[PDB]
Amino acid sequence: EGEDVTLMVNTVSSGTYAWYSDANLTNLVASTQNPVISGLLASNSPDTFYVQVSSNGCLSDTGFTVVQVNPNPAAVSPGYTPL
Amino acid sequence: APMTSNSGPICEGEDVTLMVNTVSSGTYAWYSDANLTNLVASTQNPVISGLLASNSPDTFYVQVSSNGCLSDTGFTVVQVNPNPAAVSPGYTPL
C-alpha cells in the first residue's frame, strides 16, 4: 500500500486497449498496454482486472490479471530506558 | 459513446486527471457544460487544475471528434475534497 501497480497487456499492435475493474465492461480504469493504477488497498488484496484489446473494428477476449496488494506493517512505538 | 473515466477524489490544490477511453479515430474534446461551450480539454488524458470543493461534483462532458464524425456526449464527475481547516496549535507556558 502506497506503491502503484504496473498493469500489462501483451503487445498487440492492432488497436486501442481497455481495462476495467469488473469482469464486465464498466469503469475503464486503464486504456493502454502498460498503464499504472494508483490507490489500491490490501483491504481488497486480490484485485482482479479485466483485459480487452480493442482492435480495428474488432474486440478481443476478456483476459484477467490479479494484483496482489501487500498490507502495510503496523506503526512502531519505540521507547527507551530513562537515563 | 466513448467510455469515460477520471482519477479518484482530488484535494483542493491537487489537479485532476480526466480521461476518454482510447478511441484512435480523431481529436478529443471536453467541455464544462453538458453542451458544447468552453473547451476545457482537447485530448484523451488532459489534466484540469484549479477545481474547488465549493463545486465538489464537477461534471464534465465527453466528445470524441472522429474524422468527419462526432460521438455521443459522455460525462465524468470529478469529486473535489474540501481542505481541512487550519490548525492553531499552542503550548503550556514553561
Neighboring chain A residues of B8 at a CB cutoff of 8 Å: 39
Closest Cα in chain B, distance from residue A53 (Å) = 11
The tally of CA atoms less than 13 A away on the side-chain side of residue A62 is 10
Tell me, in Å, the resolution of the deposited structure: 3.8
Nearest residue to B12 (alpha-carbon basis) of B89, B90, B94, B78: B78
Q: How many CB atoms lie within 10 A of CB A34?
A: 11
Neighboring chain B residues of A28 at a CB cutoff of 8 Å: 3-5, 19, 21
What nine digits make up the cell of B51?
A: 477545481
Closest Cα in chain A, distance from residue B16 (Å) = 13
For residues B18 and B60, give the distance between their C-alpha atoms in angstroms, rounded to a whole number: 9
Experimental approach? cryo-EM
Strand order through the sheet with B4-6? B4-6, B16-20, B47-48
User: A31, B8: Cβ pair inside 8 Å?
Assistant: no
Stretch (H or E) spanning B63 = strand B57-66
